[PDB]
Each structure stands twice: as structure tokens, then as C-alpha cells.
């Protein structure tokens, strides 16, 4: 099916009507998304089929048709863009300065933007347009707002 690079919606017809469960990135022939969006299930792209290739529940990432290709990283200083693809709404870039998730295994950038759960898998970009991570896995702070980690995979 469609293998052109770009951001894509992950849809399902199992529920009422057509429901958007997430978003993903097509790059170098590989579809990248978050694990909790597909649960590792096969994907359809028109008549074609995309089979899972690599995945990990702890990282919350999954790749289709090949290994993880995205390896750009947040520089720890600059503003980034969340290319949000919300359910039923047009792709729209949102600029923000990320915060930090301090963990026992190092620090990770984090974006404090609130979107429907179906926006999970939307890419976070640097000024060069490179995907530095995906949106959709983080925490809910005291006032009820959402903070997502800038989740990046490893390129082998």
C-alpha cells in the first residue's frame, strides 16, 4: 500500500464507526508507533499488510516492516514541535520548550501538551524536521494536566 514518508493515523473499525486509536511515522519503509496503540497487531494499508518487526512494552514502542529507523535526539536546550494528529482533526504543529523527566536511569525530555488519547504516536520534531521521539507515554500531574515523555527508540 502507501509507503510514502509522513505522519499517518492508526484507525479501527472494531468499535462504533471508524475510530482513531493512534498515530505513527513512516520513514525509510518502516512504520513507527507506540506499543499501546496496536498491541503488536498487524496493520493494513489499503490492500497491503504491515507485519510487526520489533517491539517492547517497557519502551512502549513498535516497528513494522523493518527495524526502528528514528534516532534524532532532543538537544536539551531548544524548543521542539509536536506534530499533533488528533482524532477527526487536521495535523497541526505546536511549538513548546520541553521539561525533564528525572529517572533512576537518566533524564528524558518531556512535553506538557494535552490531547485525546488517540493522538498517541504523534511525532516530536527538532528545527531540522527530524523525529526526536513520539508523544503518548507519560504521567498526570496534581492539577490533572498531562506530561508526555519524548519517547525515542534505538537505531541498530
Amino acid at each position: 500500500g502507501e509507503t510514502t514518508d509522513g505522519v499517518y493515523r492508526v484507525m479501527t473499525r472494531r468499535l462504533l464507526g471508524s475510530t482513531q486509536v493512534g498515530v505513527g511515522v513512516m520513514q525509510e519503509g518502516v512504520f513507527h508507533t507506540m506499543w499501546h496503540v496496536t498491541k503488536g497487531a498487524a496493520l493494513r494499508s489499503g490492500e497491503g499488510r504491515l507485519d510487526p518487526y520489533w517491539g517492547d512494552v517497557k519502551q512502549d514502542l513498535v516497528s513494522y516492516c523493518g527495524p526502528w529507523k528514528l534516532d534524532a535526539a532532543w538537544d536539551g536546550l531548544s524548543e521542539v514541535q509536536l506534530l499533533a494528529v488528533p482524532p477527526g482533526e487536521r495535523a497541526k504543529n505546536i511549538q513548546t520548550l520541553p521539561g525533564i523527566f528525572k529517572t533512576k536511569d537518566g533524564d528524558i525530555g518531556a512535553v506538557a501538551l494535552d490531547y485525546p488519547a488517540g493522538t498517541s504516536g504523534s511525532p516530536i520534531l527538532d528545527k531540522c524536521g527530524r523525529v526526536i521521539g513520539l508523544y503518548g507515554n507519560g504521567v498526570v500531574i496534581k492539577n490533572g494536566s498531562y506530561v508526555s515523555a519524548i519517547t525515542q527508540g534505538k537505531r541498530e
Binding site: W35, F101, K102
Partner: protein, 39 residues
């Protein structure tokens, strides 16, 4: 059965809407891939 639909190009947009704060949070990551606030 899940399917994919193209939603656009991945490009940086000059003069995009600038919003959101930068909080420094102490967090923990469990085996299920779920984050939690460390207190």
C-alpha cells in the same frame, strides 16, 4: 483490524502556535511501560 491513513508531511512549521510549560518531574518507569510520579 487496524488500518493506516496518511495525515501529512513531517516538517517544522515556522511561526507555529507556541504553548506549554517545561516541568521538572521525578518519575519511575515500571515493567508494564507505565510512568508514575516519585514522591
Amino acid at each position: 483490524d487496524m488500518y493506516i491513513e496518511r495525515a501529512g508531511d513531517i516538517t517544522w512549521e515556522k511561526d507555529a502556535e507556541v504553548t506549554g510549560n517545561s516541568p521538572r518531574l521525578d518519575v519511575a518507569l515500571d515493567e508494564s511501560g507505565d510512568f508514575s510520579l516519585v514522591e
